[PDB]
Ligand binder design. Structure first.
Ligand SMILES: O=P(O)(O)OC[C@H]1O[C@](O)(COP(=O)(O)O)[C@@H](O)[C@@H]1O
Ligand SMILES: O=P(O)(O)OC[C@H]1O[C@](O)(COP(=O)(O)O)[C@@H](O)[C@@H]1O
Ligand SMILES: O=P(O)(O)OC[C@H]1O[C@](O)(COP(=O)(O)O)[C@@H](O)[C@@H]1O
Ligand SMILES: O=C([O-])C(=O)[O-]
Ligand SMILES: O=C([O-])C(=O)[O-]
Ligand SMILES: O=C([O-])C(=O)[O-]
Ligand SMILES: [K+]
Ligand SMILES: [K+]
Ligand SMILES: [K+]
Ligand SMILES: [Mg+2]
Ligand SMILES: [Mg+2]
Ligand SMILES: [Mg+2]
Lengths: 519, 519, 519
């Protein structure tokens, strides 16, 4: 009894909703939340990379704060290879996007005791001198630590904190030298080569779009990447600089700004406006601002993105435990579920799938949790608030989209099939968060790939040739969707589905909503 | 600034809604609430009857508790004559329904001092003997009063109250005779011939469907009347008896039960179930139950009807003052507005248009008020509760209807055009109470006439011949609606409208919703 | 600008609420969510145990699935010693509760290769024979594994899964022997001595209250423990058995049932009824039911407990990372915040403070997060739903409690001071979740200790002697509270506070609510 938390989504109060969550109430088979996997050593093999797709991966993240263009291009080459191995059946084929995550303006240390993987070790109380003297860039040890950020002494003050290697090792500025800093270890631990360095509450003047970044960005264009995750986006101008760089050749590449610092949070509205999406980069944010305040920023950002109808990604450490274990911790499971309940379009994995010993189990665990959570969403209230907070508009497609969602809730439809060239029609259906999956049928493969950034949209790439009889070309595509659905288990023959189409070819003419039974 | 109370319908709380009602905020030109006018001496002239239609009349009520079949048939004949005078332009033509209101089981007195219009006069304290002795049926005076209800002494007790002529004259049962009753006048006033008599809290055994009623009902069928207003409906069986009488030949005649007594109110759910609609007959109800409790019964009945999606009429004394004056009282204006706000499909006039000296002003006053009130409805909350309280269903037309309404609210559409044979598709749109007018296009004239019983539906009768190309026959009708709309001032060229259609000819296939711009 | 998320708790919609969470909006200094710390090797030292209290600990959990009575009595002795070291100032004194967590019916393995801390290692595919033959209880290795549960072969089937050491190592029943089982390792890893064993979807007949449990429970009474956390509570009868055991001598010891398995979840209502509180024991639950479904059970249990007004504890792995690191992962921070937002009375730590290398940092991290989260609660909606879902009652204290909370919201009071003997009066204020801290003043120390189980209640133990003038005895206590408040930073001199008192000594006479300014 009870499917996809029906008894619960049909309750008057949120509290009653909660009281009704049933672990014995199976969820639907469809999974709306996109899963971005950072690709690395543990997941670079075309062989295992096919298992990544099978398991759930939708977007492949290339962390460009590491690796050479020659390396990534091979990663990219492998992704596409594994991806296409399924293209021999347009029905079962699952598009996969490629995202380039810029290095941006980050600070890192040099090499430890010369050796490649040598690791010194600081101790509470011990002192450490930070040098900018390049002579030591490959001679880092318990007393001298080198950094890239050379303009450092001019932005950091006496009494400041410096964190290294994901804020695990903290230091305090005792004395500000000329080309160096005399700190004092607040908490030790071992220190490896080239690690991350955060300067909380310090105006780091590094370039929004560095030299190397422009290189990587132009490489992304040449590599035909679907999206770019810009790191350390502080203001709107920063987003604009990335637009310019991508320029005309890549005007269609979505720029997902990453909020990793305090300025980014303050100037969020400004950034969200100039971006296509947002990523709540918790890793750096958890070091830049006190950890206890991160869920506030996450919830705030996810909420404002839902209001704006722009994609939002919740990333970093969602399943860290799994880098070394086959099972995630109770807190990690709880974390994922809440990101979905918070209303995030995509959840992410980094170390979990880049170097961990259980990449496939991590990805699989996210498919599972997001599916359970998506069902626990309180649609009754969410739909209501979204419609209310939604601006007044006279755009036929906008009205058609809301109508489709309302209609879908009314008949518990198996899905909302949408024909789209650019994806916009399907985006609009998504911004109203229906419970049914949004099967977006398209012939444009870039839009099919980029579609994963949206909650609910299940991209489907039509390969069939255009019929001369537009009416039958449309009906053909609607059937394509109808089959994908039947095959993936979203719905059966008798079931009812909502179909969105337009009155003439081209974009921006969606305006037809039909409640159709499955063939 | 502000149209049709937009500022107000867009407020978070009801209280804020009220605070925003603007008398300087003009309403749309369309009027959703049907207006039923009781036709009589003051409005029987084809010449004036055309002005009734112009002014706003949608349904013509024939009070069959008076007049001869020969008389009514002529009334009917005149209505249709005045009505068809406009048929020479399908676009400007306004359908008009004919309703037969049964006499039912009513009690009336005999003739005063023989004379036709003679009027005696009782006095508080004075005694009055009620006789069943037929010898006096034309000899009524200050001492002997005759009644039709002969089984009276067997149902009335000592101490009971008897009201005469719309509860204006009250009497009390002092002594129960064998064939008479010795009362005492509680409040006097004059007493004319054949007046109404109520026996509050008394189980009058009169027949739900009397002899004469069966005659009148069968006459209704032969006269091809759209609806029947059954008087004093006490239980479901009563409604059933009227169904049977109308039988197969008139199975398509809508039976609007009238709640006029205490039993009717108690067994309401039972009655509403077996009926097509309900009429809150306040006149008799105001005598049968204490006046202060009428608004409770009205609001209760109207609310339950909205929940059930069945038509509800608020009738009697809405504009009495106007029987003799050109202006209505503040209370009457207030009464009409609240009936609309209460959510009644139709408002009614009786004496105001049957014998009053300003029938046209009364009808015009209702077009005016209803329009103002319709705009003051708090749709935000109404729509919400209707959808919640609405049962779960998998009927495609139902889903399509809700979708259309949601869509209409999203783009402030000028209308919701609906193609329907039986009326059902348009009914469903109406039960969800959209702000826009529901232009229902049909070729069946009976359904066009009966449609007035529903809030929002604006019937439009298509006279064009069926095209062989169904697609074009549909498009033709949608354009018919599009023109009626343009001509009645509902919308202009650029405006957007919602259009409801189906996928194949025949009833029950509506499932297509399109946001279309006006040609 | 903005304090304790005021701008946010004052928004019409939840979505708007979220959009307003400000990381730059400091929270009040008071922290409502109780913190239960499991005491062990890393936190048993009276010296460090004083730092546990300073850092935030409110309740000390004794995990009786380990250690000897002699050991625990010493832990208890140390807790009280550290606790009382502050009693020399009733104002700054912070009560601390002692909770006994039963071993209950658990299954564990024997010893590895004889050696105390020796660890074998299974491998996927490899086979393992499970023996009940006591000869091997201290000879466990890669081929023979021993178990306590001897009736095992009779409840497990062929094809079943067996998990060992927090579901990290899984096994599958290939062949069911007579006194043994021939399994196959699904996922390896190392295997230590005496580890946990779960038999998902298997009806383990072990005793609700085992032999050892009765011993421990009686020991708890003799030790004067405030509460008992009953493990693996499956039905109401189980709770009853624990009541009986504690019997008359310990009728005042609160029984917090722990839901660790599937039956417990199904029969929750039954258990919640018979218990004083509930603990969502995620560890075992996460093994007993699929991990992805835990947040469903957690949110469900927490919600139903808030509805019932009984304490609920969210426990296990909330900050695992911190067992070895000074910083928690983003997921763990997110986990804690959501448990508070979910509406849990208490958060807990186990390995984090029993054996971890940073117990104090773990406890401190919870004080911090819970405070931030408590401020992000959406009171506007929570209060509303709690009041609506709250049964109708004529109990003066109940009405007085609601009135106090409403009043507190109206004037942004610094606190709600409540005089209570049993605690009940303060409980009732807590079940309505006010934003302000509930300073409960009492002379009964057991009730001051047990009060931590409730969200918002800040226990304060009055040591002053009873005045003969009851009126002044009361006024004295209210002032005691008034000072505690001023010292802890809850409120200043000018501030306003809500005060709850009664009209006569004894319990159940609270009925007086006063809005008083701080002396
Ligand atoms: O690309 P968009 O803006 O989402 O619009 C989707 C479009 O695809 C259609 O359904 C079919 O159009 P095409 O044949 O050009 O692909 C249109 O009716 C509609 O305008
Ligand atoms: O009469 P209903 O039940 O309201 O249905 C309206 C019907 O009219 C249409 O719009 C047109 O049908 P017709 O050509 O038969 O009149 C259908 O698609 C739809 O089924
Ligand atoms: O113990 P309870 O049931 O919470 O009631 C609190 C009681 O404490 C008082 O505030 C003060 O009474 P005492 O002096 O006996 O402690 C009473 O008025 C009230 O009845
Ligand atoms: O880049 C990231 O994912 C981060 O900084 O958290
Ligand atoms: O018949 C009526 O209109 C009444 O009784 O109110
Ligand atoms: O007992 C516990 O806390 C558990 O099992 O998770
Ligand atoms: K990066
Ligand atoms: K009548
Ligand atoms: K235990
Ligand atoms: Mg980063
Ligand atoms: Mg009447
Ligand atoms: Mg346990």
């Amino acid at each position: 009894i009870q499917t996809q938390q029906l008894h619960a989504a049909m309750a008057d109060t949120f509290l009653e909703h909660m009281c009704r969550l049933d672990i014995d109430s199976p969820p639907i088979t469809a999974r709306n939340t996109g899963i971005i996997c950072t690709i690395g050593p543990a997941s670079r093999s075309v062989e295992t990379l096919k298992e990544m797709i099978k398991s759930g991966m939708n977007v492949a993240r290339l962390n460009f704060s590491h690796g050479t263009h020659e390396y990534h291009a091979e990663t990219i080459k492998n992704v596409r290879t594994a991806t296409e191995s399924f293209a021999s059946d347009p029905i079962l084929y699952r598009p996969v996007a490629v995202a380039l995550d810029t290095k941006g303006p980050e600070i890192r240390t040099g090499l430890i005791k010369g050796s490649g993987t040598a690791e010194v070790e600081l101790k509470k109380g011990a002192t450490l001198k930070i040098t900018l003297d390049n002579a030591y860039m490959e001679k880092c040890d318990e007393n001298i630590l080198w950094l890239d950020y050379k303009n450092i002494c001019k932005v950091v003050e006496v009494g400041s904190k410096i964190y290294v290697d994901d804020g695990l090792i903290s230091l305090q500025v005792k004395q500000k030298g000329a080309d160096f800093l005399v700190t004092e270890v607040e908490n030790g631990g071992s220190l490896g080569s080239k690690k991350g360095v955060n300067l909380p509450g310090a105006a780091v003047d590094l370039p929004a779009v560095s030299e190397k970044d422009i290189q990587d960005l132009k490489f992304g264009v040449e590599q035909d990447v679907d999206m770019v995750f810009a790191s350390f986006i502080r203001k709107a101008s920063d987003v604009h600089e990335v637009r310019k760089v991508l320029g005309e050749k890549g005007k269609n590449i979505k720029i997902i700004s990453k909020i990793e610092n305090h300025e980014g949070v303050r100037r969020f509205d400004e950034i969200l406006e100039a971006s296509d999406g947002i990523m709540v980069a918790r890793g750096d944010l958890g070091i830049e601002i006190p950890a206890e305040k991160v869920f506030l920023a996450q919830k705030m950002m996810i909420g404002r993105c839902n209001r704006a109808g722009k994609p939002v990604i919740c990333a970093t450490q969602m399943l860290e435990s799994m880098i070394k274990k086959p099972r995630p911790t109770r807190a990690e499971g709880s974390d994922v579920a809440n990101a979905v309940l918070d209303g995030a379009d995509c959840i992410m994995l980094s170390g979990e799938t880049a170097k961990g010993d259980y990449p496939l189990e991590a990805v699989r665990m996210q498919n599972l949790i997001a599916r359970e959570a998506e069902a626990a969403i309180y649609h009754l209230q969410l739909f209501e608030e979204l419609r209310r907070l939604a601006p007044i508009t006279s755009d036929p497609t906008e009205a058609t989209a809301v109508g489709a969602v309302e209609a879908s809730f009314k008949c518990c439809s198996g899905a909302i099939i949408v024909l789209t060239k650019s994806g916009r029609s399907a985006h609009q259906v998504a911004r109203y968060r229906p419970r049914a999956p949004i099967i977006a049928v398209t012939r444009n493969p870039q839009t099919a790939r980029q579609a994963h950034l949206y909650r609910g949209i299940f991209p489907v790439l039509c390969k069939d040739p255009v019929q001369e009889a537009w009416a039958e070309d449309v009906d053909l595509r609607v059937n394509f969707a109808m089959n994908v659905g039947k095959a993936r288990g979203f719905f059966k023959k008798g079931d009812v589905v909502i179909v969105l189409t337009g009155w003439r070819p081209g974009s921006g003419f969606t305006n037809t909503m039909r409640v159709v039974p499955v063939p």
